[PDB]
């Protein structure tokens, strides 16, 4: 008809406020990242600051719905800080019960490693 | 000749690990629109989370020599988190160091609110 709903279609500026939907990619990649690089052996105090820096993330995110949400499912299911593996792994089921409640389907969480820090074995991203 | 250096016309894949430069965008991203979207009469316990949190960011940061730089200028530059207004402006001039230590210009603070809350006055972003 002319309009259209697809939004790379539509709004070409892109240093434009980010919506609900492009923080919500900004900031599974910053989480991400940082749990694929914490340590595998971290201190006491590294994996209570990353519990601590969890807990403050769901304070401030300013979709407040999505924030609402999320410091529900911190209280059923406290972060596992223990481990690099723990914590990515940890960090993925999270993200799946995310894409779950909207409709998306499960990201294979053994390819965690790959999708956030070494690339696809394939080497796709090289 | 015919490789080139100039990523966009190289590695087409979207969902590989970001680089040191595209988790910078999207950190960007994440601690302005935080920023933004901060109380402009927060309590004091949200003003000394959001000191935390900033912290925290910066002991997690995972490029070590970004982290590392980052550190070092929290310990001059203490995170103002009194109000929306001071915390927006502090991130915009700690965000224009580092623009400045690369070779990157200034960031008119003034377009703060325009660009990461509200879009751009003329409604570019509509
Ligand atoms: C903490 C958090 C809570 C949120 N809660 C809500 C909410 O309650 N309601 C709402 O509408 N939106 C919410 N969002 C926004 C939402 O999750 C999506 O970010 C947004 O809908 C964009 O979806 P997307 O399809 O682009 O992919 P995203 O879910 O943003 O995923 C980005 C990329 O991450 C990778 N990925 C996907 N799943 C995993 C996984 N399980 N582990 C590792 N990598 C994965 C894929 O490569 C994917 O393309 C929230 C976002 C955050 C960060
Ligand atoms: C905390 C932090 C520390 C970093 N330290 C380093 C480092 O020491 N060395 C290094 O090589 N890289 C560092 N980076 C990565 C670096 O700052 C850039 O993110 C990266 O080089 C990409 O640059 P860019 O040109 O895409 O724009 P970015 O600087 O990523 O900016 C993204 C967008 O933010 C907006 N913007 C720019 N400046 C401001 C401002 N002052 N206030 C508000 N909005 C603004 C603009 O619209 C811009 O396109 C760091 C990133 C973070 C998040």
Redo the contacts with the bound molecule.
């Keep these: 008809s002319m309009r259209t709903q697809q939004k790379r279609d539509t709004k070409f500026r892109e240093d434009c406020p980010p919506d609900?939907?492009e923080?919500?990619?900004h900031?599974?990649?910053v989480?991400?990242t940082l749990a694929a690089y914490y340590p595998d052996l971290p201190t006491p105090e590294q994996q209570q600051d990353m519990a601590q820096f969890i807990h403050l993330?769901?304070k401030f995110?300013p979709?407040e719905?999505?924030?609402e949400?999320?410091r529900k499912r911190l209280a059923r299911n406290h972060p596992d800080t223990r481990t690099r593996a723990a914590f990515t792994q940890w960090?993925?089921?999270?993200?799946?019960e995310?894409?779950r409640?909207?409709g998306?389907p499960?990201?294979d969480?053994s390819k965690?490693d790959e999708?956030?820090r070494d690339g696809w074995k394939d080497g796709s991203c090289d």
Tied chains: 1, 2.
């Design positions: 609900r939907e923080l919500g990619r900031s599974w990649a989480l991400h993330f769901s995110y979709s719905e999505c924030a949400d999320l960090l993925c089921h999270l993200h799946n995310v894409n409640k909207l998306k499960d990201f969480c965690v999708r956030w």
